[PDB]
Design a protein around this ligand. Structure first.
Ligand SMILES: *[B@]([O])(O[C])[C]([C][C][C][C][N+])[N]C(=O)[C]([N]C(=O)[C]([C])[N]C(=O)OC([C])([C])[C])[C]([C])[C]
Ligand SMILES: [Ca+2]
Length: 223
């Protein structure tokens, strides 16, 4: 997260770290057995790590559970990053408590102007690299579809939104992919792509979760 702040241990209780030997992407716990992340975070042999603050120290609140199956969206296009959403089922249900909690799925899409919380263990520098060990948070508004489409001419689909600052300085970055964008308590976005990080006039782009709620409910219901 570039230009954000330290969340505080377990204050974002639905944040997961996806681990295949090291943290490679974030995700959101949406019920005790299912995680939603970005389809570009797909790989085999993912262990889901819940209740993390420092991803390098076992502090006591963690639950490390293997993925039993991954389902990438049926229309994910890695070239356009259109439909960048994937579901991960855990092998066993997690024990939910105040430090491990699921986030609600939206019933409506959120408006431009809505302030959101974005979180992750990704790069904190816009030039060069420094990966944090503890979770970082950022508050950023949803941008209008006009601003988003003029920042990225020809790249924004109806399943994408921009959230951030046109002045730059604050943004998600490498290592934040798959993580939550939560606005008014509902999961509204997934960290997906952008032109670098915290670049002027180049805000982050996010998968628009409200478009996928029937696919998410149907897949959970049958798997
Ligand atoms: B993610 O992979 O973290 C593990 C990361 C989050 C980036 C957040 C940006 N606000 N996502 C990516 O790296 C994705 N790629 C890009 O965002 C690339 C670098 N952007 C890009 O090439 O920009 C253009 C030149 C305009 C197309 C990919 C999906 C891994
Ligand atoms: Ca830890």
């Amino acid at each position: 997260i570039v230009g954000g702040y330290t969340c505080g241990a377990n204050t974002v209780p639905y944040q997961v770290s996806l681990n295949s030997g090291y943290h490679f992407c974030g995700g959101s716990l949406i019920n005790s057995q299912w995680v939603v992340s970005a389809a570009h975070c797909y790989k085999s042999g993912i262990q889901v790590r819940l209740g993390e603050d420092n991803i390098n120290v076992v502090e006591g609140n963690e639950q490390f559970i293997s993925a039993s199956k991954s389902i990438v969206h049926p229309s994910y296009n890695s070239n356009t990053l259109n439909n960048d959403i994937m579901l991960i089922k855990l092998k066993s249900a997690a024990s939910l408590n105040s430090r491990v909690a699921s986030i609600s799925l939206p019933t409506s899409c959120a408006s431009a102007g809505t302030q959101c919380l974005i979180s992750g263990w990704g790069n904190t520098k816009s030039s060069g690299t420094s990966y944090p060990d503890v979770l970082k948070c950022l508050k950023a508004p949803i941008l209008s579809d006009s601003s988003c489409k003029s920042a990225y001419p020809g790249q924004i689909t109806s399943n994408m939104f921009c959230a951030g600052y046109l002045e730059g300085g604050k943004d998600s970055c490498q290592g934040d992919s798959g993580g939550p964008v939560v606005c008014s308590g509902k999961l509204q976005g997934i960290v997906s792509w952008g032109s670098g990080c915290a670049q002027k006039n180049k805000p982050g782009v996010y998968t628009k979760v409200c478009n996928y709620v029937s696919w998410i409910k149907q897949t959970i219901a049958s798997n």
